[PDB]
């Protein structure tokens, strides 16, 4: 039994290694230390300084350098006793300051132990290296074990959710968020892998597994922060029957990065699929698709990157092709999908020229005809739709000859439409196959980014940040009930903060940012400036969460849960409307392609509501998501990047701390720190501290009484503790002191 077998890879890779003795005595030390900032400037870098003396009011301690310093006892970041180094739950720390938190995490990570609980959260730090803790053999160990029985692990929360589901007959949720490359996708995949195993009977299960490889081909790409970035968020419903077996599944996708199709930063790549196709297509397909090397395509040849290190596009294509096969995509459907991809490539190879007059024209219809071919549309018709769309100028419908820029920008729009619609299609197709109308229970897995604060923040960042404000509030309300419940299950004694930021964004009356945005979107002639001015007119010095910049005329800031975020307004009106000329819609609507036809003919795909804005849709989709979550028992996994360099064994305190500040971990602890953070089961206390008092035996039948004894013996300030129905509750620092007592 691996749990017992100290020689198992379970013990090796998942636990702090244990020696022969448990004896309190081993960890004895007269030394007292604190966490300090060697440089007041950088306050996330800390060093440990041994307290050399103490006043009634302060502490005086020797630095790393050997230089003495002094601090107020009340600002003091006392270091927990060494015994606490490496505990599996930060809730178990006695001194809970930020530096204490970081160190526990660090201690763990230094042993390659990536998972740590912080109360209700499962903290997962990207190791940036392989750890063999996801084998079937590993899965098997977590079956039916309590959180407290096994080591922290993604499999563990997963197992806990499944048992709760079975036991409470309640739907569940796992919220996996964090920064790009923090490891959300990986963790998500492990959750499904595990549920598939633990609850499977397979064919279905297979299809379920296979959807992912498909989605990843189309929704993932190589970026500067990760080589296989998922550029879309998702909510995955794993469905089960009353008996506990997987009966189906559903996927909801969000915020796919369409911009990527037409433009990629230096070093990055376009979506994997493009590459897979160019490399994995039969030389007999190429020709049929007029394919060539990426260097041959504008949408591929601009980042200088066309291949991933230790990645075979050819091989991945096979992988993807197979998956499609398994889920249920006809050989034919598969063509057109490839065709669309192809055609997209072609579209971007159209060179707009404009000398004649001012309007663009096409001297070389090669690329054009190429695309029209694979699309099954009429080049003449498409040619005109791109450069000469009829626009309703009042009562009349007149064709405007577009210049080169506008012309290019239209083609671009056409490609993003095609891409986003195809994606929707894929997802809907997959769901047709996997989804259950008649389902008994479900476990939904939300895998999306946490708060986004980049150099430059745009409309999509406001969106994701809005979602985050809502999930953070959901967590907070969740923690508040659960805490009350606990105090209550024992017999202890005793509306929010995110609302305002939430209101500022999505408020209807007075209108918040998005409503103002929608208002401006109705006027064809509105501009970024009219937009931004309207926003400042409504909120500058008038809404405490908003800030109009001292000099920039194109940005505005929002005080988010994670801090202030500065947004820029460029193209917001265009983003909100997500326009596509109707002539283009016309052109594609008659496609000779059976798939392409759906992308333009099917309203559930070709349009939003078309009537509602992108903002309005975002809002609604989020309300739906939240309502769903609301009906579930949730579980939270915070994924953390250890540094910005994709390096293992490099845990940077500033990078780390900042994530924990933003993701709710540190706040949860601060809040916890205030009450009775340490909650021990009587026997457990006694079992370690019986030697602290006289006459107390390790194994006492009246554990509560015996606890009272030791406490008493040591004359502990009863304000510091609370006797509960099954556990002794301790205020911060109390247990540290106890631990620090003499045998
Ligand atoms: Cl593994």
Tab-separated table of N, CA and C in Angstrom, residues 218 336-338 340-341 344 416-428 595 599 605:
chain	number	residue	atom	x	y	z
A	218	UNK	N	-7.123	23.441	-32.772
A	218	UNK	CA	-7.809	24.662	-33.181
A	218	UNK	C	-7.758	25.842	-32.198
A	336	UNK	N	-13.584	19.574	-45.494
A	336	UNK	CA	-14.005	20.953	-45.370
A	336	UNK	C	-13.342	21.679	-44.211
A	337	UNK	N	-13.243	21.051	-43.029
A	337	UNK	CA	-12.583	21.707	-41.905
A	337	UNK	C	-11.176	22.103	-42.324
A	338	UNK	N	-10.573	21.187	-43.067
A	338	UNK	CA	-9.220	21.380	-43.562
A	338	UNK	C	-9.208	22.396	-44.656
A	340	UNK	N	-11.435	24.842	-44.906
A	340	UNK	CA	-11.587	26.132	-44.228
A	340	UNK	C	-10.268	26.666	-43.718
A	341	UNK	N	-9.514	25.760	-43.167
A	341	UNK	CA	-8.246	26.141	-42.657
A	341	UNK	C	-7.423	26.628	-43.847
A	344	UNK	N	-8.573	29.799	-45.333
A	344	UNK	CA	-8.199	30.894	-44.478
A	344	UNK	C	-6.792	31.342	-44.822
A	416	UNK	N	-11.477	35.967	-39.320
A	416	UNK	CA	-11.722	35.732	-37.926
A	416	UNK	C	-13.096	35.177	-37.759
A	417	UNK	N	-14.025	35.617	-38.616
A	417	UNK	CA	-15.387	35.111	-38.532
A	417	UNK	C	-15.425	33.631	-38.834
A	418	UNK	N	-14.766	33.323	-39.912
A	418	UNK	CA	-14.673	31.944	-40.319
A	418	UNK	C	-14.076	31.075	-39.201
A	419	UNK	N	-12.965	31.526	-38.651
A	419	UNK	CA	-12.291	30.794	-37.600
A	419	UNK	C	-13.130	30.621	-36.331
A	420	UNK	N	-13.683	31.712	-35.823
A	420	UNK	CA	-14.516	31.634	-34.624
A	420	UNK	C	-15.774	30.811	-34.851
A	421	UNK	N	-16.340	30.912	-36.057
A	421	UNK	CA	-17.527	30.110	-36.328
A	421	UNK	C	-17.219	28.639	-36.487
A	422	UNK	N	-16.098	28.358	-37.109
A	422	UNK	CA	-15.715	26.981	-37.258
A	422	UNK	C	-15.518	26.414	-35.857
A	423	UNK	N	-14.885	27.162	-34.997
A	423	UNK	CA	-14.653	26.682	-33.651
A	423	UNK	C	-15.954	26.351	-32.911
A	424	UNK	N	-16.895	27.251	-33.043
A	424	UNK	CA	-18.173	27.057	-32.412
A	424	UNK	C	-18.803	25.738	-32.864
A	425	UNK	N	-18.671	25.534	-34.178
A	425	UNK	CA	-19.166	24.366	-34.912
A	425	UNK	C	-18.574	23.090	-34.381
A	426	UNK	N	-17.270	23.127	-34.248
A	426	UNK	CA	-16.557	21.999	-33.718
A	426	UNK	C	-17.130	21.721	-32.367
A	427	UNK	N	-17.172	22.728	-31.536
A	427	UNK	CA	-17.710	22.480	-30.220
A	427	UNK	C	-19.126	21.968	-30.262
A	428	UNK	N	-19.946	22.534	-31.113
A	428	UNK	CA	-21.312	22.046	-31.111
A	428	UNK	C	-21.414	20.606	-31.616
A	595	UNK	N	-20.235	22.371	-44.726
A	595	UNK	CA	-19.896	22.838	-43.408
A	595	UNK	C	-19.978	24.348	-43.413
A	599	UNK	N	-21.908	27.515	-41.041
A	599	UNK	CA	-21.292	28.660	-40.397
A	599	UNK	C	-21.991	29.934	-40.785
A	605	UNK	N	-24.918	29.918	-34.831
A	605	UNK	CA	-23.509	30.060	-35.042
A	605	UNK	C	-23.169	31.342	-35.766
